[PDB]
Amino acid sequence: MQKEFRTSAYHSRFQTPFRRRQEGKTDYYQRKRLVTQHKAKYNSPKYRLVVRFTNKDIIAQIVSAHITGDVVFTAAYAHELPRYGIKYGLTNWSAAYAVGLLVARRALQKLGLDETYTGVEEVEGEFELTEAVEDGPRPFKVFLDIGLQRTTTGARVFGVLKGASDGGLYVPHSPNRFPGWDIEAEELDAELLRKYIFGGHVAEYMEELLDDDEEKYKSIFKNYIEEEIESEDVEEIYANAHEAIRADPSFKPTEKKFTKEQYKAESKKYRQQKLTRAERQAKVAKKIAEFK
Amino acid sequence: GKSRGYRSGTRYAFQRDFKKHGAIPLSTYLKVYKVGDIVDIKANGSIQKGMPHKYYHGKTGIVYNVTKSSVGVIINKVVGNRYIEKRVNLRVEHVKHSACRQEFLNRVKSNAAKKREAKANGETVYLKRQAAKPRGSRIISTEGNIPQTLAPVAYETFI
Amino acid sequence: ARRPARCYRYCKNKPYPKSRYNRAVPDAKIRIYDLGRKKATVDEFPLCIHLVSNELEQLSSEALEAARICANKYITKVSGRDSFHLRVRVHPFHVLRINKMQGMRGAWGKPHGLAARVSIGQIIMSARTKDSNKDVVIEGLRRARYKFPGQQKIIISKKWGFTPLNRDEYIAKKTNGEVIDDGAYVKFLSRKGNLEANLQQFPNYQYS
Amino acid sequence: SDKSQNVMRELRIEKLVLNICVGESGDRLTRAAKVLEQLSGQTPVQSKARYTVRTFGIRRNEKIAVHVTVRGPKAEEILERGLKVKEYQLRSKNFSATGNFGFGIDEHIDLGIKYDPSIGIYGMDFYVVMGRAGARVTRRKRARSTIGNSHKTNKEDTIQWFKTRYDAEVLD
RNA sequence: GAGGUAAAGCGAAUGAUUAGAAGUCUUGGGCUUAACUUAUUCUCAAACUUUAAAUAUGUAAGAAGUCCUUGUUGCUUAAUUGAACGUGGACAAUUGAAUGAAGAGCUUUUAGUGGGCCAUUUUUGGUAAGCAGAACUGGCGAUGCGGGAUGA
RNA sequence: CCUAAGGGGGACUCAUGGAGAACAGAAAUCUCCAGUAGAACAAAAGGGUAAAAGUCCCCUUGAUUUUGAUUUUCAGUGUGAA
RNA sequence: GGUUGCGGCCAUAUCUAGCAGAAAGCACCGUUCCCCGUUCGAUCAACCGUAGUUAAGCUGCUAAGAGCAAUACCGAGUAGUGUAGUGGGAGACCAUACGCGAAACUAUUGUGCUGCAAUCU
Ligand SMILES: [Mg+2]
Ligand SMILES: [Mg+2]
Ligand SMILES: [Mg+2]
Ligand SMILES: [Mg+2]
Ligand SMILES: [Mg+2]
Ligand SMILES: [Mg+2]
Ligand SMILES: [Mg+2]
Ligand SMILES: [Mg+2]
Ligand SMILES: [Mg+2]
Ligand SMILES: [Mg+2]
Ligand SMILES: [Mg+2]
Ligand SMILES: [Mg+2]
Ligand SMILES: [Mg+2]
Ligand SMILES: [Mg+2]
Ligand SMILES: [Mg+2]
Ligand SMILES: [Mg+2]
Ligand SMILES: [Mg+2]
Ligand SMILES: [Mg+2]
Ligand SMILES: [Mg+2]
Ligand SMILES: [Mg+2]
């Protein structure tokens, strides 16, 4: 009764979007605004702090874009944190802060700007930007790229922001998206921000849940229970981790249990292979014959 | 009433290519232009800022100025009995590097390499390009290729 | 009313069709393009005879109507109304203009009539019939030729009816099960697409 | 693999939407909103007419209808309270091809709430959107995709699930 | 490099359009007609189009070039990065396609003119016109001479 | 003609069709699916635009100051506009 | 080789209908004290990685698949066209000479390639 829509003309005239837009992964509007560089700064690249959250991991990368593809400068993942002493809550706002601090320290070590631009060595939660030192190189400038993730006051991407800013990178930002920002009275409550930096919210949940719902405390905070980690010593886990991250921010790759060839040979066993033209012609001939 | 507006007659010139509408791929914004570069001008209809006039659509020129998002291009236009130097400000979406530079610069590199190697081998080489010359003599073998005789065909109607 | 056709014989202007730009255009005199037994199957009328243009020219809708009527009347009178299927292959889509119906000021004309722009070798009329009805169909077209200006040729087609296949390739594809009826026309077998649907639609398909 | 008796293929209610399309604006619509807030415990939202129709007495952007969306156990409670009014007998023609179903009560006191002369009686519309786990794929911002054909909810599956879960009847 | 005219296309979008056939009417009436849907069919577009010429058109084919080394700045870079302009060094007449070149470049000053017309080809209005209006070129005007008997 | 129909940011996706829901029916409101834009973008027409240039929301005055360069029409004068 | 993050070109990558998927990743998935946003913790925010699952997403494979791309003793040196004649023809138009040269059609083949970082039976 109604016209069939998916005609051959519909498919012929359909213009498919960009591959990574159809994947729903790249916002090319924002990407153009982030990447495009002043034409009189000819080959000087703009550096992005790409911050992406998965269900289990925090990915922070410093990236510059080129015609053949993006090039990673350094990268810090949340699963590197256990090396530094954070094994649980690998997606906290505080885990985000630690990852941002780690990527900042690693980038500055790679560049050579360690003694200059140390950052906020005494984290009190105050809003601060990395100021340049007179008669010295300017701080490494990086712009935050949160991708498709929504901008909300209290979001974890700005946790990675705050960690990277305190780590010595100059990343331009405002404090009105941090946890503890009073929108009515436009000032930042640094006490609550420091709480979030050192897992204060998580510790308060532990304390509030333990005396109200012990069974839920046992299921949600199992790993802490078998690790004998209470609320009062939650903060120290981060406070030490910070210090260790500043002590040795260098990247240590995981020792690989197999070689590239072994990985490839194992994976190739589970990969279906395309039928040859002759094979599918033979299948067609067989189906015709069995159709008589 | 005659109409001679800025974009008159650009109905097809300023159209996007079929199945090529929408966002600009970012290699356009990643290319680097220096003063003295030779660039083609091709208006992109989806960017209306910094758009060239229809005369410069399809022209090639020299970059003379580099600004935040644009380049200044020098074009020579015939006005009566002489050329006038025109200075056009174009956003980089309407600009592309000219491919004639890389070919001539490659012939320069190849000539330098051939001349130095010929000097190393102690011989001489001629570097001037040559037009296609008439072909030389040749012998056509007919083993397996004995000439087939054709004739004009009679008239037929095929409808 | 109507000027002599000589005033509009030649394709001097660009095509001027009905559009959103000219709207008050009269109708063509020809409205019927298929006559005779238009529902006959392809196998019933193997012989095709064409009236072909040897002119780059314009034919009015009035001439198209007159020739259609003349050919139809003669062929139905001599051989019966169901012994043929006549098709007029040119549609008048070009609007002629008339000025008088001051001086040369504002002389852009008003729609006056419709004409078909025909090329050299363009088919004007096609008549599919049986072989035994050749001389009749030919004389029907030869009479219709008088209603047209210029030179036209009566050409006996090499093909089966209104199909694009010769009278031997059609028989080969018919005995090979590659042709099925579609009412007045046929559908041909394709070696592309869904194999099962192709086989179902052409059951007698002797695959090689 | 691809086993139909998988845990994640379980049908369950996504949302229940309660609609009262009072044809006018003002006191009647306000009292209908009061009824909806009473039943659901949630502030309802008023919908405006998309265009003007003189026959129906509505105009564009005039607040006409009121509706509310409930999810979870509260949706289940309201749905079974309404199925009591329907005496657990829907029609085969109450289920859409996409696996959703709906019915409409005519008096809101049949649901089991107290009647007030000031409020009056409003009829009400119930619609239940069915869905399995993984529907977040079609609603999330990043990497949004479509649901595979086998994981989709359809009319036959929804009818069978309704008959099993409510011991009710679907009048074919 | 650019182009969207000729051609082509319409079982490709838009718009126009001839004919049957098979289904659905469940939201048309009296087996029936008419609607739609599906696969087909005839014919079209200066102000339609996926495609797309020929002719015409932009740029380049070096010494003011290419490569190597390292100076200036308040611009620019996280930078010791660049941008521009440079010092110093190497590559010599096949110095980097053809053909031609009563030489190239530059300046001042002033006359007449600012009714045009014709032919081929492209082309608009008009039934057409030794009609009216455009495109490119060549002519007449401004030009005699041989031919078209005669004739811008 | 417009204090937004200007500027910035964010969120959302349009025309239309199908299948469903009391009154409710061809057209009210609700839901899902399909939907390359077949919608919309002040006004002619053409071009352009889909995580937007469209719809809705938040904040605003870059519709500000200074005087040069350039493009179009062009005599390479003015005006307008960019 | 698989996978993820960020990409380049932007369908050989899209679309429809099926099937398979080890490891890790990704994902769905669980919860609402806290920052935050909603008619609705569905989306968005936060928390746990603890209770579960490859069902879906994703990836690959299948189809005389639609589409798309490429190629060509396919059509066709056809249509068109630059240049020429005191060529033909009443004309409409056409042929010839020196050059350039399509589109549809037909057939065949293919169905993402790839850069940086990290990771994995
Ligand atoms: Mg954004
Ligand atoms: Mg174009
Ligand atoms: Mg503007
Ligand atoms: Mg004319
Ligand atoms: Mg044009
Ligand atoms: Mg044409
Ligand atoms: Mg074509
Ligand atoms: Mg068409
Ligand atoms: Mg004078
Ligand atoms: Mg004068
Ligand atoms: Mg005068
Ligand atoms: Mg004179
Ligand atoms: Mg003379
Ligand atoms: Mg003489
Ligand atoms: Mg004479
Ligand atoms: Mg606007
Ligand atoms: Mg605004
Ligand atoms: Mg926006
Ligand atoms: Mg000027
Ligand atoms: Mg001006």
Distance CA D98, CA D129 (A): 9
Other CB atoms within a 10 A radius of the CB of residue D103 amount to 18
Residue type, B146: I
Secondary structure class of D114 (helix, strand, coil): coil
How far are the Cα atoms of A120, B148, C12, C24, C124 from residue C17, in angstroms, in the given order? 79, 52, 14, 11, 19
Q: Which residues of B touch C158 (CB under 8 A)?
A: 157-159
How far are the Cα atoms of A173, C44, C87, C129 from residue C37, in angstroms, in the given order?
83, 10, 11, 9
The resolution, in Å, is 2.5
DSSP A173-222: --GGGSTTEETTTTEE-HHHHHHHHTTHHHHHHHHHHHTT-HHHHHHHTH
Q: CA geometry: angle at A281 spanning A275 and A286, to 5°? A: 110
Give the pair of three-digit tokens for residue C189.
Answer: 């077998």
Nucleotides on chain G that have an atom closer than 7 A to a protein CB are 1-2, 4-11, 13-23, 25-31, 33-37, 39-40, 42-68, 91-94, 107-121
Residues in contact with A132: Cβ distance below 8 Å, sequence separation at least 6, in sequence order: A138, A139, A170
Question: How far is Cα A122 from Cα D68, in angstroms, rounded to an integer?
Answer: 50
Query: What are the residues of chain C with a beta carbon less than 8 Å away from any beta carbon of chain A?
Result: 195-196, 199, 207
Cβ neighbours of D87 (radius 10 Å): 8
List, in order, residues 6 or more apart from C85 with CB less than 8 Å away.
Answer: C34, C35, C36, C37, C38, C40, C45, C127, C128, C129, C162, C184
Indicate which of D142, D145, D146 best probes the interface with A, i.e. most A CBs within 10 Å of its own CB: D142
On whether the CB atoms of residues D70 and D19 are closer than 8 A, the answer is no
Give C126's strand partners.
C50, C87
Question: Distances in Å between the alpha carbon of B35 and those of A42, B64, B106, D21?
Answer: 11, 5, 20, 68
* Residue closest to A275 by CA, chosen among A283, A285, A264, A266: A283
Give all strands of the β-sheet with D63-70 in edge-to-edge order: D45-48, D63-70, D12-20, D124-131, D101-105
Which backbone phi and psi does C133 adopt, to 5 degrees?
-95, 25
Distance CA B108, CA B129 (A): 12
Place of tokens 């093909």: C159
Q: Which of A107, A105, A113, A109 is nearest to A163 (CA)?
A: A105
CB–CB of C15/C93 below 8 Å?
Answer: yes
Contact D45, D37 (CB under 8 A): no
CA distances from A49 to A34, A46, A132, C103 (A): 11, 10, 19, 78
Q: Which of A39, A46, A68, A145 to mutate to test the interface with B (most CBs of B within 10 A)?
A: A39
Please report residues of C whose CB lies closer than 8 A to that of B159.
50, 52, 123, 155, 157-159
Distance CA A218, CA A231 (A): 14
Cβ(B62)–Cβ(B36) below 8 Å:
yes
Residue A63: CB atoms within 10 A of its CB come to 21
Distances (CA, A) of A264 to A138, A257, A270: 45, 13, 10
Nucleotide nearest to D108 (CA to C1'): F22
DSSP string, D25-81: -SHHHHHHHHHHHHHHSS--EEEE-SS-BTTTTB-TT-EEEEEEEE-THHHHHHHHH
CB C63 within 8 A of CB C148: yes
Given the structure tokens 């879960």, which residue do they identify? D165
Strands (E), B2-150: 38-41, 60-66, 70-79, 82-91, 95-97
- Alpha-carbon distance B120 to B123, whole Å? 8
Pairing of strands D12-20, D63-70: antiparallel
Query: Does A292 lie at the interface with C, CB-CB under 8 angstroms?
Result: no
Spell out the long-range contacts of D94-98 with Cβ–Cβ below 8 A and sequence spacing 24 or more. Answer: D94/D170, D95/D155, D95/D158, D95/D159, D95/D162, D95/D170, D96/D155, D97/D154, D97/D155, D98/D152, D98/D153, D98/D154
Distance separating alpha carbons of residues C13 and B156, to the nearest angstrom: 33
Residue C92 CB coordination number (10 Å): 24
Residue B104 has φ and ψ, to the nearest 5°, of -70, -35
Burial (CB < 10 A; 0-12, 13-18, 19+), residue B125, is exposed
Non-local CB neighbours of A101 within 8 Å, separated by 6+ positions: A163, A164, A166, A167, A242, A245, A246
Two tokens at B110? 């190849």
Q: How far is the CA of C130 from the C1' of E20 (A)?
A: 19
Distance from the alpha carbon of residue B12 to the mean position of ligand 5, in angstroms: 7
The Cα–Cα gap between A242 and A247 comes to 9
Which one, of C125, C99, C122, lies nearest residue C110 by Cα? C99
Question: Cα–Cα distance between D128 and A144 in angstroms, integer?
Answer: 42
Ramachandran angles phi, psi of C77, nearest 5°: -70, -40
Provide the shortest C-alpha distance from residue A149 to chain D (in Å): 8
| D156: three-class secondary structure by DSSP | helix
Protein chain B, residues 49-78, with a C-beta closer than 7 Å to any atom of nucleic acid strand E: 57-61, 76, 78
Chain C residue with CA closest to A284: the answer is: C195
What DSSP character marks residue C20?
A: S
**Closest by alpha carbon to D165, among D90, D97, D108?**
D90
Query: What does the alpha-carbon distance between residue C33 and residue B149 come to, in Å, rounded to a whole number?
Result: 48
Please tell me whether any atom of strand E lies within 7 Å of the Cβ of B112: yes
CA distance A144 to A129: 14
> Is B125 flagged in the annotation as binding?
yes
- CA separation for the pair D29, D58 (Å, rounded): 13
CA→C1' distance for C145 and E59 (Å): 59
How far apart (Å, rounded) are the C-alpha atoms in residues A206 and A219? Answer: 12
CA of A176 to C1' of G18 (A): 52
Give how far D142 is from chain A: nearest CA, Å: 5
**Nearest CA to CA, how far is C124 from chain A (Å)?**
32
Q: Is C189 helix (H, G, I), strand (E, B) or coil?
A: coil
**Contact yes or no for A177/A67 (Cβ under 8 A):** no
- Cα distance between residue D160 and residue D169, in whole Å: 10
- CB of D135 closer than 8 Å to CB of D147: yes
B157 CB neighbours in chain C (<8 A) are: 155, 158
Q: Which residues surround ligand 4, an ion (CB under 5 A)?
A: C 12-13
Kindly report the nearest CA distance between residue B111 and chain A, in angstroms.
Answer: 30
Quote the tokens at residue D4.
């139909």
Instruction: Say which residues have a Cβ less than 8 Å from residue B6's Cβ, sequence separation at least 6.
Output: B53
* Interface residues on A facing D, Cβ-Cβ cutoff 8 A: 23-25, 147-150
Geometric angle at alpha carbon D151, from D145 and D152, rounded to 5°: 80
Count the Cβ atoms, other than its own, within 10 Å of residue A254: 8
Closest by CA to B41, choosing from B97, B81, B1, is B97
SS3 assignment for A156-179: CHHHHHHHHHHCCCECCCCHHHCC
Maximal C-alpha separation, chain C: 76
Tokens 């897992």, residue located: A199
Do D and C share at least 3 CB pairs under 8 Å? no
Residue D60: C-alpha distances to residues D23, D30, D50 (Å): 12, 19, 5
Measured distance CA(D109)–CA(D105) in Å, rounded:
10
For residue C160, how many other CB atoms are within 10 A of its CB? 25
What separation in Å is there between the alpha carbon of A54 and the centre of ligand 17?
Answer: 35
Q: Name the residue closest to the C1' of G118 by its CA.
A: A75
Contact C158, C167 (CB under 8 A): yes
Instruction: Residue C111: name the closest of C100, C101, C96 by CA.
Output: C96
Output phi, psi for A143, to 5 deg.
-110, 140
Closest CA to A172 of A49, A64, A61, A37: A49
Contact C199 A288 (CB under 8 A): yes
Tokens of A178: 């941090």
Count other C-beta atoms under 10 Å from residue D8's C-beta. 8
Q: Determine contact, residues B58/B43, Cβ cutoff 8 Å.
A: no
Locate the chain B residue with the closest alpha carbon to C49: B159
Contact residues, chain B, for A27 at CB < 8 Å: none
Task: Specify the nucleotide whose C1' lies closest to residue A145 (CA).
Answer: G6
The sign of the torsion formed by the CA atoms of C2, C7, C9, C15 equals: negative
C123 Cβ partners below 8 Å, 6+ apart?
B159, C50, C51, C52, C53, C89, C90
Tokens read off for B90:
């174009």
CA end-to-end span of chain C: 65
Long-range contacts of B43-47 (CB under 8 A, 24+ apart): B43/B10, B43/B13, B43/B14, B43/B94, B44/B16, B44/B93, B44/B94, B45/B14, B45/B15, B45/B16, B46/B16, B46/B21, B46/B22, B47/B91, B47/B93, B47/B94
Q: Crossing angle, helix A157-166 and helix A190-197, to 10 degrees?
A: 100
